[PDB]
Design a protein around this ligand. Structure first.
Ligand SMILES: Cc1cc(Oc2ccc(CC(=O)O)cc2)ccc1C#N
Length: 188
């Protein structure tokens, strides 16, 4: 068949009931995730191919970057709570992996200030239990599929994208094969 288990995707042996339809996991410390966001715009291109009524969820992980990696999961919870993912994703990637200007939780906070989130508003969110709950949701979802690597993407808690079974001689063709696979899986 054109799409085959083990080629463009793998099937979870333990399916996760009631999981988000399209669930992406990343880390601001992960070099491939930097490419997935800034060079390939994977999330945007998947979203532009997805059927109607299919929601996309994207979560940060703790297992890279020790203390700061856990700060970044909480900061991503702040980004989701305030709805400013599109404003902070690039400066967070570049601050961690390009310019090496993110070394502390305060440096993370500076990205949000510079992106226009008020200081009192960032701090209220950071300390809020709504943000604690969002952190817990990110952890639970990763635990549900015993996640040990990023980037990763899961469709209906059943299928996991397999990018290494795709051709990368052309970056645009790769992106569209990846997105078409997500669409194919969402339609299973
Ligand atoms: C075109 C392209 C394709 C890639 O394919 C992969 C390979 C492995 C993983 C998971 C992991 O091992 O971290 C994720 C995507 C990666 C980077 C770029 C760029 N520019």
């Amino acid at each position: 068949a054109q799409y085959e288990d083990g080629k463009q995707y793998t099937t979870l042996e333990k399916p996760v009931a009631g999981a988000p339809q399209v669930l992406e996991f990343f880390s601001f410390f992960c070099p491939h995730c930097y490419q997935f966001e800034e060079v390939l715009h994977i999330s945007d291109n998947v979203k532009k191919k997805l059927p109607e009524g299919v929601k996309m969820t994207k979560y940060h992980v703790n297992f890279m970057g020790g203390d700061l990696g856990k700060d970044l999961t909480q900061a991503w919870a702040v980004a989701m709570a305030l709805g400013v993912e599109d404003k902070v994703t690039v400066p967070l990637f570049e601050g961690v992996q390009k310019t090496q200007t993110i070394r502390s939780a305060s440096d993370i906070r500076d990205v949000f200030i510079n992106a226009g989130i008020k200081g009192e508003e960032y701090d209220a969110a950071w300390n809020s239990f709504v943000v604690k709950s969002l952190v817990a949701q990110q952890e639970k979802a990763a635990a549900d599929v015993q996640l040990r690597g990023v980037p990763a993407m899961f469709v209906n808690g059943k299928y996991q994208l397999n990018p290494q079974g795709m051709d990368t001689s052309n970056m645009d063709v790769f992106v569209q094969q990846y997105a078409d696979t997500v669409k194919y899986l969402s339609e299973k």
